[PDB]
């Protein structure tokens, strides 16, 4: 449970407390939930980009071996 | 070509169901599919999903065979015949976990 | 910039947060601040959309009446 | 033949013998007994590290391989069990938990 | 007749009741065109219930009762239906009408 | 019902009308603000006028839009659609709506 020190614009905190007074939660409960959403969003997108990059690197292998074993598949069909 | 998980195509000719995730279905030459046959109309296994002809525009009632899965070149996918809703894909999901012991 | 405060984030969330920091070449505060903004904008917007609906639905009786009471004037200026 | 989920065999990928690639059985064990077909996942040695969340690394010394290899859970297919020849080894519960989560990602599951 | 953007008139909504109205069309068109674009005004409310509303104080602008301009209610009429010129709104009040109008018509 | 900004419908009193209200008003209010459409002119150059050639937006007729001729009616006088103007078209409209209403210069 690390702990830290931040500096938010005076307007943004004023607005933030607005949504707090309304949804009946605290600042930290909201900041924490906001950091989660942002970090989940960034991690996900990063992972999607690494999956693409990998698939595109693996094309030559995956294609070759998909063909090399084509006949085996076709036989295990109407069997 | 943009193939989507749930799309059913003809393949080079027999029907076929795309079951691979959509990221791979875009940035990869290969697609993982599950055969479809019309020699039966009812499920004979917990690895089968029935397809109604009138509901999904088939000439005759068919059954997806989640015991019959293979990865092919997307280039063999020709005509897109239809797409299965979330309901039908929840069946394919649990049939696939049984087939591959993902309990 | 302005106010300054004290928070307690889970140890895993900060570890992950520094991950995205080391990558996008920014600081914690630059990221926390950007995150609070996005969240607050999202909440304010949705709240406002809900007040607009509620108002339109309260104003239906008036807006309809006067849209009719001035119909002919409209049609003549055609 | 008694094939078990977790068994890795060599397979013959020819139209009859005219000579072979490693392969991992991933189908449930009931089907692996009372069915002519087996569902497997290819294995290659052209890489030694995972390049995808659909990959599972195999150490050479730990599992008696000539050279470090990687299982390709994007590469799966059902074949006739008769093409399974040599049983090279079997993977523990640890290694099969990896294959499990790699497979669910590859097929958008759970 | 010389109508100015910001002028509020009574208008005759008959084929040959009478309701207040706010001219919002540019001044060039307000001169060399038979038609005027206006925005209705009502007194059934005294407070804004929408970001498309602008309040009008009675004592400040010589109204019998507090009123609200409805920038969701706009139409173009024949200038001839404009009779009595009640008042004119200052730059302050018209900056409100401006931002309420851009919201109403998604010019944001 | 189904109304959205930039959709053109038919009217009742026959008339083609461009819907120009915000999409929020369009959903929860009985009234909708439209702009007149006429086929009498094909070209029509002037600041408050926008040009549609029919051979694009499923139109049968070369029409022109009038940001000087707008009105606010009951939602139910909007029967069935026609098309939806793409963004680039809407930008030219707004670019004239603002001139019409004196929201620039």
UniProtKB/Swiss-Prot annotation, chain A:
It comes from the Bacteria. GO terms for molecular function: identical protein binding. One of its GO terms (biological process) is regulation of DNA-templated transcription. Changing residue 58 to A: Still prevents EndoA toxicity upon coexpression in E.coli. Changing residue 62 to A: Still prevents EndoA toxicity upon coexpression in E.coli. Keywords: Toxin-antitoxin system. Homodimer, forms a heterohexamer composed of alternating toxin and antitoxin homodimers which inhibits the toxin's endoribonuclease activity. Antitoxin prevents RNA binding to the endoribonuclease. Belongs to the MazE/EndoAI family. Antitoxin component of a type II toxin-antitoxin (TA) system. Antitoxin that directly inhibits activity of EndoA in vitro. Upon expression in E.coli counteracts inhibitory effect of endoribonuclease EndoA. The EndoA-EndoAI complex does not seem to bind its own promoter. This is Antitoxin EndoAI. It comes from Bacillus subtilis (strain 168). The lineage of its organism: Bacteria, Bacillati, Bacillota, Bacilli, Bacillales. The gene is ndoAI.
UniProtKB/Swiss-Prot annotation, chain C:
Changing residue 59 to A: Still prevents EndoA toxicity upon coexpression in E.coli. GO terms for biological process: regulation of DNA-templated transcription. Changing residue 56 to A: No longer prevents EndoA toxicity upon coexpression in E.coli, due to loss of EndoA-EndoAI interaction. GO terms for molecular function: identical protein binding. It comes from the Bacteria. The keyword Cell membrane does not apply. Keywords: Toxin-antitoxin system. Belongs to the MazE/EndoAI family. Antitoxin component of a type II toxin-antitoxin (TA) system. Antitoxin that directly inhibits activity of EndoA in vitro. Upon expression in E.coli counteracts inhibitory effect of endoribonuclease EndoA. The EndoA-EndoAI complex does not seem to bind its own promoter. Homodimer, forms a heterohexamer composed of alternating toxin and antitoxin homodimers which inhibits the toxin's endoribonuclease activity. Antitoxin prevents RNA binding to the endoribonuclease. This is Antitoxin EndoAI. It comes from Bacillus subtilis (strain 168). The gene is ndoAI. The chain holds residues 6 to 83 of 93 of the full protein.
Curated annotation (Swiss-Prot), chain E:
SUPFAM superfamilies: Cell growth inhibitor/plasmid maintenance toxic component. GO terms for biological process: mRNA catabolic process; rRNA catabolic process. Changing residue 26 to A: Not toxic in E.coli. The record marks 19 as: Transition state stabilizer. It comes from the Bacteria. One of its GO terms (molecular function) is RNA binding. Changing residue 72 to A: Not toxic in E.coli, 625-fold decreased RNA-binding. Changing residue 53 to A: Not toxic in E.coli. Pfam families: PemK_toxin. Keywords: Endonuclease, Hydrolase, Nuclease, RNA-binding, Toxin-antitoxin system. Its EC number is 3.1.27.-. The keyword Transferase does not apply. Changing residue 10 to A: Remains toxic in E.coli. The keyword Nuclease applies. Homodimer. Forms a complex with antitoxin EndoAI in which the toxin activity is inhibited. One dimer binds a ssRNA substrate, forms a heterohexamer composed of alternating toxin and antitoxin homodimers which inhibits the endoribonuclease activity. Antitoxin prevents RNA binding to the endoribonuclease. Replacing all Arg residues by canavanine yields an enzyme that recognizes a longer consensus sequence UACAUA, thus altering its substrate specificity. Still cleaves between the first and second nucleotides. This is Endoribonuclease EndoA. It comes from Bacillus subtilis (strain 168).
């Amino acid at each position: 449970r690390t702990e830290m020190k931040i500096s938010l614009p005076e307007n943004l905190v004023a607005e933030l407390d607005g949504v707090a007074m309304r949804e009946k939660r605290s600042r930290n409960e909201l900041i924490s939930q906001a950091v989660r959403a942002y970090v989940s969003e960034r991690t996900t997108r990063h992972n999607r980009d690494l999956m693409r990059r990998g698939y595109m690197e693996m094309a030559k292998i995956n294609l070759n071996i998909s063909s090399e074993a084509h006949f085996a598949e076709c036989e295990a069909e109407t069997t | 070509m943009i193939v989507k998980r749930g799309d059913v195509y003809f393949a080079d000719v027999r029907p076929v169901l795309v079951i691979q995730n959509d990221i791979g279905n875009r940035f990869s030459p290969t697609a993982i599919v599950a055969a479809i046959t019309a020699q039966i109309q009812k499920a004979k296994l917990p690895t089968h999903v029935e397809i109604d002809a009138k509901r999904y525009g088939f000439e005759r009632d068919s059954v997806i065979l989640l015991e019959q899965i293979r990865t092919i070149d997307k280039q063999r996918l020709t005509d897109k015949i239809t797409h299965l809703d979330d309901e039908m894909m929840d069946k394919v999901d649990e049939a696939l976990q049984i087939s591959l012991a993902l309990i």
